[PDB]
Amino acid sequence: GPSDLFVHTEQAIYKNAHLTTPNDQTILLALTADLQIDGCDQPGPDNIPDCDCTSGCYYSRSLDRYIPVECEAHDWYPVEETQYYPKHIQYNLLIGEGPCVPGDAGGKLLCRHGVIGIITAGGDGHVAFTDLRPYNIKATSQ
């Protein structure tokens, strides 16, 4: 079935700006990660954990189902200029070994606990994953 929907945590709706770019109501957004956060009274179970494992499972669109994969978390990696954004450096990226296609973007990667990041980047035999951990209500401050 259709699994293409945004994520709502408590009162923060996280989604891809390059796939949403809504009005100017978005509370805060980080162009560096092309992620936006809006407000709403539609709280969901979506609660990013405090750990971002490496070997998990992401929703593979090529097989229309979750598949086991292994990505390595990186404090920051270079993102070659593309249709999304120009050349720069991102933060919290999980690069692994998997197929990539124009649409697979958005695949949530569940680990020992659960979703730890979605597909934000993709390359040859390599798939990046935006770590949602370093953003949610894990601690903040400092």
57 binds Zn ion (CB under 5 A): no
Interacting positions 111-140 with Zn ion (CB under 5 A): 111-113
CA distance 116 to 110: 6
| HSE-up of residue 56 (Cα within 13 Å, Cβ side) | 30
51 binds Zn ion (CB under 5 A): yes
Strands 28-30 and 12-16, bridge-based pairing: unpaired
| Beta carbon of residue 47, minimum distance to Zn ion (angstroms, whole number) | 13
Written as six digits, the tokens of 66 are 């979750």
* Of the residues 6, 7, 18, 53, which one makes contact with Zn ion according to CB under 5 A: 53
Eight-state DSSP code of residue 120: E
Q: Which stretch binds Zn ion (CB under 5 A): 36-44, 76-84, 107-115, 130-138?
A: 107-115
Q: Decide whether 31 or 51 has the Cβ nearer to Zn ion.
A: 51
CA distance 1 to 4: 9
Could you list the residues that contact Zn ion (CB under 5 A)?
51, 53, 111-113
